[PDB]
Amino acid sequence: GPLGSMEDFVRQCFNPMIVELAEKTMKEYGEDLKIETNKFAAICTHLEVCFMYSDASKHRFEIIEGRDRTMAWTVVNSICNTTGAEKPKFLPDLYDYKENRFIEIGVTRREVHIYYLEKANKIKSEKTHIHIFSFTGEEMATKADYTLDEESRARIKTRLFTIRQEMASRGLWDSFRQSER
């Protein structure tokens, strides 16, 4: 049918705060949202998932993702100096004060196991916990430890489904799904 604009969709369906943060991210990494619209959408999605993940248990998680890079690294350094946790080589999305480990969160259109393996290879850290969500409800987590209960993760998955099917409703899904990497 009628093909829609990804930028319009992103601005209509994501919270304005999230949008601003995503724009800030893309500016920071030199990417133009006006052209890299799928990347823009993905960054919004990943941000929202990180925030929902944090929100599932307030006072447990420090949020790293969303801050400017220097600020984020400052926070990471602070957490390491305060808790004695090993410094990660790449910027994680969260810190878990309860389990005393950083959390890397992935959101993928690809096969979750493969994606997980790529992440676990590309962090080269050992204590950082990895949690991968797909748009079809699949999950993959380090040591099969999923951290949050089924209801919280169900909320996350449901949001992902909503996004996927509104995109599909606008004819955006086909392009978005294969523009990964």
Ligand SMILES: O=Cc1cc(Cc2ccccc2Cl)cc([N+](=O)[O-])c1O
């Ligand atoms: O897909 C977008 C995306 C964005 C981010 C945000 C981000 C975090 C750190 C550096 C650059 C960027 Cl774009 C992170 C991940 N990730 O960890 O799977 C992402 O998959």
Ligand SMILES: [Mn+2]
């Ligand atoms: Mn990150």
